[PDB]
Amino acid sequence: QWLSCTTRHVRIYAAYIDPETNAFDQTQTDKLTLMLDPTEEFVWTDETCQMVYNEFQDLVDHYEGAPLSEYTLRLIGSDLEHYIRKLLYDGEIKYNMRSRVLNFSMGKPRVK
Amino acid sequence: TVMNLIEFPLLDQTSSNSVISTTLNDLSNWSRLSSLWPLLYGTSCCFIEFASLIGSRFDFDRYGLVPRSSPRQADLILTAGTVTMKMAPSLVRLYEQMPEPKYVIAMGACTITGGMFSTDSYSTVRGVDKLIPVDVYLPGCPPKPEAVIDALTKLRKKISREIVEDRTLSQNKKRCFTTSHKLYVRRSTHTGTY
Amino acid sequence: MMFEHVLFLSVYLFSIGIYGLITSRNMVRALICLELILNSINLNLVTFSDLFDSRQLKGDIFAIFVIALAAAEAAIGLSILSSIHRNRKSTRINQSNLLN
Amino acid sequence: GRWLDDVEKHKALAIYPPHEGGYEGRYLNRLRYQGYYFLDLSARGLGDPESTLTKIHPVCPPSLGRQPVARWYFPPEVDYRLSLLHPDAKGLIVWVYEAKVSRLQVLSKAELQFLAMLPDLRVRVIAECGNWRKFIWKPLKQISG
Amino acid sequence: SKLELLKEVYGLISILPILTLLLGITIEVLVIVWLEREISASIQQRIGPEYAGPLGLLQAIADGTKLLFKEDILPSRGDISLFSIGPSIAVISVLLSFLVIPLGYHFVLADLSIGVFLWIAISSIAPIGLLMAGYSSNNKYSFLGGLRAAAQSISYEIPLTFCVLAISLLSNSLSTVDIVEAQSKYGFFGWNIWRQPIGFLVFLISSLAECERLPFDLPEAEEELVAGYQTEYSGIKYGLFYLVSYLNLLVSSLFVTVLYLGGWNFSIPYISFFDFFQMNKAVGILEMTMGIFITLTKAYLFLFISITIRWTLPRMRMDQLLNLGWKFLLPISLGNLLLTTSFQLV
Amino acid sequence: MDLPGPIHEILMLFGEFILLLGGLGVVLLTNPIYSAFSLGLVLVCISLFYFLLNSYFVAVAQLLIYVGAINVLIIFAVMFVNGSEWSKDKNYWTIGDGFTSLVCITFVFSLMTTIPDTSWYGILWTTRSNQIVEQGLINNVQQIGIHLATDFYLPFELISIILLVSLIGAITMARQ
Amino acid sequence: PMVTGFMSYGQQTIRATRYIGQSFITTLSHTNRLPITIHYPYEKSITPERFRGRI
Amino acid sequence: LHEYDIFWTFLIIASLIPILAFSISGLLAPVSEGPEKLSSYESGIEPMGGAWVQFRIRYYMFALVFVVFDVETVFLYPWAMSFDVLGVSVFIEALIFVLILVVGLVYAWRKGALEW
Amino acid sequence: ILGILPPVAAIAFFYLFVAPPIIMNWMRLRWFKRKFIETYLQFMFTYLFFPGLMLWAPFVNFRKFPRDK
């Protein structure tokens, strides 16, 4: 069923959920939706996420020929966990900046 | 020449609230921290001493720590024992399926980094915060049976550091994206028969 | 409006009790509506034994007996439901006309 | 503002609470509405605290078993946090949580005196140390030396 | 004139004593949860809910206030159509029972000659709410988790009835006050628990499973699936279920002591507490507080007995529980009535 | 015994409006378990009607023997009918829906116009000796208590064997 | 038969009671025992001279 | 049997109690939890699907025998109240009554009805 | 009607003044070495003087107490 790689900030859902509630948690699993970091570890302006949305087709259509297995889900999440690292290593995106614990998965800032 | 600077504080954070409307939530969060309940979870090399926290050596139940074996009820879960790649895709479901005043922490040095499982192995996950946002990281493999109570006392203050306007930072939005697939389905592999 | 408004609701239940009976499709719904009709008649009965006949209650005893027989019938009908669902693996009432 | 009675004027103090913390958070709640914004540190771990509050100090990251010299040259946390602070802010309220008992550099009382000057010269710092059941506060500079 | 109604607008009802009963029952809930969390987990253990002040006297209401917010979740399958409707029946079934329960000399809330009958009738409405709640969701661990309890509860009211009737036929009444009236004769000889201990045994053993004792056999073993039909019920829902459980316990203790023991009678008959002094001056508040005193302690004794029994027997499985409730308690709970018939024949 | 006052008709209308919606839920909703729960609601709100009128036993018993045993039995029964969510939209079934909703309304009209022509408050005056006795000093659990066994001896002796036969038949039928 | 049941129904109950009351009066000295378990967090355990903490 | 006005006031108050508590919870609550929220407690990742989990075959017999054996009590109560008031005839009548259902219970016991 | 206040005031104040701060001392003095029925002594009193026992329950206030003018 809905066996998706639901890692932090990487939830490639193998089932249609883009309502407030999927009403079945899967909606028969025919769309393969995705939500980006509900914990707000990164604040998003549309333009910044537009490159990720564009390369989503590069990851779902350009290099996909294997059946619906989490093998492909790791094949996606691997580059997904480094596209954000690249987008931050060049300063285009920044961290949460809210009243949460403000954890640093990639460590504190640097001086280049 | 700073790398990965922090975002600017957008609000000016300038406000003033009445005491008769603030002390209510103040004592409410005081109760919320002084009535926390554990959630049962424990796997491996950094767990077993949790059991001793219920006896005559260590007794954290003295503070009202009611151990609940259910996600939707409790709010405090201890990721005791070193976690691997698997048992995680169902672990995060627990954090997703409990009320919002969770304020989860960690336990076991092999869960903040993966200490004794960090030379070469395709099973162990490097830390837990790369799966779930928690607050405090607890060292020790096995974790010191007293350090956990001290870290609970530490976290006991963060909730007391909350105000009435803070009860809006748990509301969510939806970055729900409309993207489909084109691939072939796989039938269920975990066939339950003998 | 005690003595007058309640009876105005007896029919307004009895009728419904019959309708759900006729338009019923599953056995359990038909039995529910049957019980509903019996309760309608019970209610139409009791009020009569409160306005008058207070020396020796002649309605409340009859209401008790009606409730007892209603419970007995609701037991027996469900018992028959067990056996029918054992024989055929569906209890669709209106799809069994092999006796005509 | 009972804390305000001994923070704006002194700018140097230490919190002596009971060893549970279940009575002190209310105090921290009130100091978000003047220009004071929280910086918790848990001082244990850093070397000479000067280069931790003024200078670009290389914080050696937790090593991964291999990789000889690799230190990301981390920055200080005073002037940058001022740059993120608005021009409408009274002071930087800071908590030296690991100030106690009852090439590193022991954060002794001399180091606290040298952390009592950044409040005055160029952060409203408060030391932490558990004490008697009644939540008390005391100027640590006189305790310092 | 008297156009519609002169003195009949709203000034015929006062809601003071009802709210006093509410405050009292809430305080007693705090007391009983303190009893549990300070005696059960302290037999050979550490102290109970310390650090909530001196002792856990504030811990109970602290847990209540914490459960108050707790962001009620309302799962998807099943909704307000039956979810919020579930625990309401549960809480009302035991809250309304507080009507006919007395506390002392002339402190009953309603004479209600059908009192104990009303209590027995209201005790057999909870299973409806339990089945509704357990089915208000869709997944397992709540459907069967509630089905088990709703089923096994049904297997016990018959001994309850055949033990309450074996006392109604002794007191020749159905109102609690007259029951304790027929029992204040010999101080403690005339107490029904000595006249009919065979009925008291059945009532006491049934009371355990009737107030969900035990719903889970072990501190680690669940309530037979993962939990007792209260898994998704997170905030005030689980709070109300905790309440209704403790309140069933309380009503059972109060009823067994008001039936088989002297309700507000001393060890010496209740009327005799006035005659031996030849005069009384201010016995009003004395007798009021002493009725709250000599009565609540007797039920406290059974609270403690149940607390102790909690850690002495492995509560049976629902393969033995039905057997015990049906083929064991029913025959003797009928035979005691068959005996007391000829016993009260005189 | 008697009732408070002009609060009476308030509770009367309230209970009537509750019971109407209850019956409509019994008869309309397709999901049978919702129907059974609405039936339970109907029966408790009619037990309250029984209690309002000063007849106490036939109220509390009706609450115990129906709102208890019968409803939980029916709930157990609905665990044997599979397949729900039939059609909908304004008489989901065939024209038989309309034919019923016609003939039932004719039945209503007939009885509902027969009733408001009999002066019930005038049929109460002609009997001023029936409810004028009370036997001298009795309460209303002893009225039934005695008048069930002093003259209703035969049906009380009878009902028991009916119960026994029903039990035997139910066990012999339900068991395979 | 029933005479064997009329003889053993008291035996089952007497065994149940001989076990229940025995365990009850035995755990009586446990519910009100005189042991003192772990004290507050200000009463940490003693540590002999072979362990490992912060190197 | 004089004034159930206290009963009615207690009914309305204790029926307002649950909706009052629910509404009070709702007022001071979080407008949050837009997560999955479509699956319930202690579940294998998203387990979903399944039916025909009844085992009504066993418990139905218990329910039936209970429903039949219950009616005894609401007939005994008017008798249990009117023992001394009347003579001893009601004693024999109720003995016949109860003995009928004792025989019924004996039958239900012998032939396997009350089982595992 | 004049001298009625001292009697009903002194006993009603003692009913809620002395027991609250001393129940916590009698329970803290012995908690693990009690007898089989000793815990029954002060626990019952936990209700009787309750008019004031809750006033010295953890409700004990730590307000800032505006000082002498």
Q: Give chains near I: 3+ CB pairs under 8 A.
A: E, G
CB contact under 8 A, F96 and C28: no
Residue found by looking up tokens 């492909």 in the block: A72
Scored b (16 or more CB within 10 A) or e, G1-30 reads: eeeeeeeeeeeeeeeeeeeeeeebeebeee
Tokens representing D99 are 């100030």
- Using CB atoms, which residue from B2, B134, B176 is nearest to A109? B2
Work out the angle at residue H112's Cα, subtended by the Cα atoms of residues H107 and H113, and round it to the nearest 5 degrees: 80
Using DSSP, state whether H107 is helix, strand or coil.
Answer: helix
Cα separation of D137 and A93, whole Å? 42
With residue H23 as reference, give the H or E element that holds it. helix H5-27
Tokens representing E28 are 């007693």
Q: Which domains does chain C have, with CATH numbers?
A: 1-87 (1.10.287.3510)
Binning chain B into helix, strand and coil, the percentages to the nearest 5 are 25, 5, 65
Tokens representing H16 are 């307002």
Cα separation of C50 and F139, whole Å? 14
Binning chain G into helix, strand and coil, the percentages to the nearest 5 are 55, 0, 45
Cα separation of E113 and E176, whole Å? 8
Using alpha carbons, list the distances in angstroms from residue B27 to D4, D26, D95, H23: 21, 9, 23, 21
Written as one string, the DSSP assignment of E80-121 is: TTTTTHHHHHHHHHHHGGGSS---STT--S---TTHHHHHHH
Cα separation of D68 and D90, whole Å? 44
CA F175 from chain center: how many Å? 30
B90–chain A Cβ distance below 8 A for any pair: no
Q: What CATH number was assigned to the domain covering residues B19-166?
A: 3.40.50.12280
Tokens representing F13 are 């209308």
Residue found by looking up tokens 């309530």 in the block: E223
CB contact under 8 A, A64 and B182: yes
Rg (CA), chain I: 16
**Measured between CA atoms, how close is G35 to chain E, in angstroms?**
7
- Greatest distance between any 2 Cα atoms in chain C: 54
- Considering only CB atoms, which chain B residues are within 8 Å of H39? 93, 97
Q: Where are the beta strands (DSSP E) in F3-160?
A: none
* Residue F96 near residue C22 (C-beta atoms within 8 A): yes
Tokens representing F31 are 């999901």
Cα separation of F17 and F12, whole Å? 9
Cα separation of E229 and C17, whole Å? 34
F51–chain E Cβ distance below 8 A for any pair: no
* Residue B29 near residue E182 (C-beta atoms within 8 A): no
Using alpha carbons, list the distances in angstroms from residue C68 to B28, E110, F62: 53, 29, 10
Phi/psi of residue H90, nearest 5 degrees: -60, -30
> Other CB atoms closer than 10 Å to residue H29's CB: what's the count?
16
E75–chain H Cβ distance below 8 A for any pair: yes
Closest CA to G13 of B162, C58, F52, E329: E329
- Hey, what's the torsion of the CAs at C73, C75, C79, C80, to 10 degrees? 10
Using DSSP, state whether E188 is helix, strand or coil.
Answer: coil
CB contact under 8 A, G37 and B58: no
Cα separation of E119 and B117, whole Å? 62
Closest CA to H35 of F11, A11, B190: A11
* Residue C27 near residue C83 (C-beta atoms within 8 A): no
Tokens representing H4 are 């159930």
Q: Which residues pair with E81 in a beta bridge?
A: none
- How many residues are listed for chain G in this entry? 55
> Other CB atoms closer than 10 Å to residue G39's CB: what's the count?
13
With residue A12 as reference, give the H or E element that holds it. strand A10-12
Cα separation of C38 and B153, whole Å? 64
> Other CB atoms closer than 10 Å to residue E50's CB: what's the count?
19
Residue found by looking up tokens 């509750």 in the block: F18
- Contacts of F32 by beta carbon, 8 Å cutoff, 6+ apart: C26, C28, C29, F78, F81, F84
Cα separation of E10 and H9, whole Å? 12
> Given the DSSP bridges, would you call strands B38-39 and A34-35 parallel, antiparallel or unpaired?
unpaired
Tokens representing F87 are 């059609």
Cα separation of A80 and D51, whole Å? 37
Find out whether the peptide bond into B142 is cis, omega within 30 degrees of 0.
yes
- Contacts of F167 by beta carbon, 8 Å cutoff, 6+ apart: C75, H64, H65, H68, H69, H104, H107, H108
- Which chain F residue has the Cα nearest residue H92? F157
Written as one string, the DSSP assignment of B54-91 is: BSSS-BGGGGT---B--TTT--EEB-BS--BSTTSTTH
Tokens representing G9 are 């129904």
**Measured between CA atoms, how close is A9 to chain H, in angstroms?**
14
- Hey, what's the torsion of the CAs at F115, F116, F120, F126, to 10 degrees? -90
* Breaks in chain B (C–N > 2.5 Å) following residue: none
Cα separation of E33 and E42, whole Å? 13
* Residue E340 near residue E75 (C-beta atoms within 8 A): no
* Residue B93 near residue H45 (C-beta atoms within 8 A): yes
CA D63 from chain center: how many Å? 26
Cα separation of E27 and B194, whole Å? 55
Domain residue limits, chain D: 1-145
* Residue B10 near residue D13 (C-beta atoms within 8 A): no
With residue A35 as reference, give the H or E element that holds it. strand A34-35
With residue A6 as reference, give the H or E element that holds it. strand A6-7
> Given the DSSP bridges, would you call strands B38-39 and B76-77 parallel, antiparallel or unpaired?
parallel
Please state which of the four CATH numbers 1.10.3720.10, 3.40.50.300, 3.80.30.20, 1.20.120.1200 is assigned to the domain occupying F6-174.
Answer: 1.20.120.1200
Cα separation of E159 and E166, whole Å? 10
Q: Compute the Cα dihedral for F135, F140, F142, F148 and give only its sign.
A: positive
Instruction: List the resolution, Å.
Output: 3.7
- Contacts of E334 by beta carbon, 8 Å cutoff, 6+ apart: E162, H98, H102
Tokens representing E232 are 């998704």
Written as one string, the DSSP assignment of E149-173 is: HHHHHHTTHHHHHHHHHHHHHHHT-
Using DSSP, state whether B105 is helix, strand or coil.
Answer: strand
Using alpha carbons, list the distances in angstroms from residue F54 to A102, C49, C50, H4, H99: 68, 10, 7, 10, 33
Phi/psi of residue A64, nearest 5 degrees: -130, 115
Q: Which residues pair with I38 in a beta bridge?
A: none
Using DSSP, state whether B45 is helix, strand or coil.
Answer: coil
Using a 10 angstrom Cβ sphere, with 0-12 exposed, 13-18 middle and 19 or more buried, the burial of residue E301 is middle
Q: What does the DSSP 8-state code read for residue A11? A: E
* Residue G40 near residue D18 (C-beta atoms within 8 A): no
Tokens representing H56 are 């009504």
With residue A34 as reference, give the H or E element that holds it. strand A34-35
CB contact under 8 A, E44 and G27: no
Phi/psi of residue E20, nearest 5 degrees: -65, -45
Three-state SS string over G36-53 comes to: CCCCCCCCCCCCCCCCCC
Using DSSP, state whether G31 is helix, strand or coil.
Answer: helix
Cα separation of H76 and F144, whole Å? 12
Cα separation of F154 and F143, whole Å? 18
Tokens representing B163 are 């105000």
* Residue A110 near residue B2 (C-beta atoms within 8 A): yes
Three-state SS string over I5-69 comes to: HHHHHHHHHHHHHCHHHHHHHHHHHCCCCCCCCCHHHHHHHHHHCHHHHHHHCCCCCCCCCCCCC
E12–chain H Cβ distance below 8 A for any pair: yes
Residue type, position D145, single letter: G
Written as one string, the DSSP assignment of chain D is: -TTTTTTTTT-EEEEE--TT-TTTHHHHHHTTSSS---EE---TT-SSTHHHHTS---------S--SS-------SSHHHHHHS-SS----EEEE------------HHHHHTTSHHHH---EEEEE---SSS-EEE-HHHH--
Cα separation of G6 and G27, whole Å? 32
Approach to solving: cryo-EM
Tokens representing D24 are 């002190």
* Residue F19 near residue C9 (C-beta atoms within 8 A): yes
CB contact under 8 A, G30 and E44: yes
Closest CA to E128 of E172, E85, E162: E85
Tokens representing H65 are 């025998």
Q: Which residues pair with D128 in a beta bridge?
A: D15
E41–chain B Cβ distance below 8 A for any pair: yes
Binding residues of B for [4Fe-4S] cluster: 45-46, 110, 141
Among F28, F43, F64, pick the best mutation site for testing chain E contact (most E Cβ within 10 A).
F64
Scored b (16 or more CB within 10 A) or e, C19-46 reads: bbbebbbbbbbbbbbbbbbbbbebbbbb
CA E250 from chain center: how many Å? 4
Find out whether the peptide bond into E99 is cis, omega within 30 degrees of 0.
no
Phi/psi of residue D138, nearest 5 degrees: -150, 135
Cα separation of A93 and A50, whole Å? 13
- Using CB atoms, which residue from F65, F140, F144 is nearest to H70? F65
Using a 10 angstrom Cβ sphere, with 0-12 exposed, 13-18 middle and 19 or more buried, the burial of residue D10 is middle
* Residue I17 near residue I53 (C-beta atoms within 8 A): no
Residue found by looking up tokens 């009384």 in the block: E280
First to last CA, chain C: 49
Cα separation of G35 and E43, whole Å? 9
Residue found by looking up tokens 């990789």 in the block: D67
Using a 10 angstrom Cβ sphere, with 0-12 exposed, 13-18 middle and 19 or more buried, the burial of residue B21 is exposed
Q: Order the strands of the D39-40 sheet from edge to edge.
A: D39-40, D93-96, D124-128, D12-16, D136-138
Inspect the structure and tell me whether chains D and H have 3 or more CB pairs less than 8 Å apart. no
- Using CB atoms, which residue from G37, G40, G44 is nearest to B146? G44
* Residue A36 near residue A69 (C-beta atoms within 8 A): no
- Hey, what's the torsion of the CAs at F50, F56, F59, F60, to 10 degrees? 150
Q: Where are the beta strands (DSSP E) in H1-89?
A: none
E58–chain I Cβ distance below 8 A for any pair: yes
> Given the DSSP bridges, would you call strands D136-138 and D12-16 parallel, antiparallel or unpaired?
antiparallel
* Residue B110 near residue B82 (C-beta atoms within 8 A): yes
Using a 10 angstrom Cβ sphere, with 0-12 exposed, 13-18 middle and 19 or more buried, the burial of residue H109 is middle
Cα separation of A101 and B158, whole Å? 10
CA F76 from chain center: how many Å? 21
E54–chain I Cβ distance below 8 A for any pair: yes
Using DSSP, state whether E346 is helix, strand or coil.
Answer: coil
Written as one string, the DSSP assignment of B153-171 is: HHHHHHHHT--STTTTTT-
Describe the crossing of helices E115-123 and E236-260 by its angle, rounded to 10 degrees: 140
Q: What does the DSSP 8-state code read for residue A10? A: E
Q: Order the strands of the A34-35 sheet from edge to edge.
A: A6-7, A10-12, A34-35
Phi/psi of residue E43, nearest 5 degrees: -65, -60
Written as one string, the DSSP assignment of F114-139 is: HGGGS-HHHHTTS-SSGGG-TTSS--
Closest CA to E169 of B156, H91, A76: H91
Cα separation of H91 and E232, whole Å? 52
Cα separation of E212 and F160, whole Å? 33
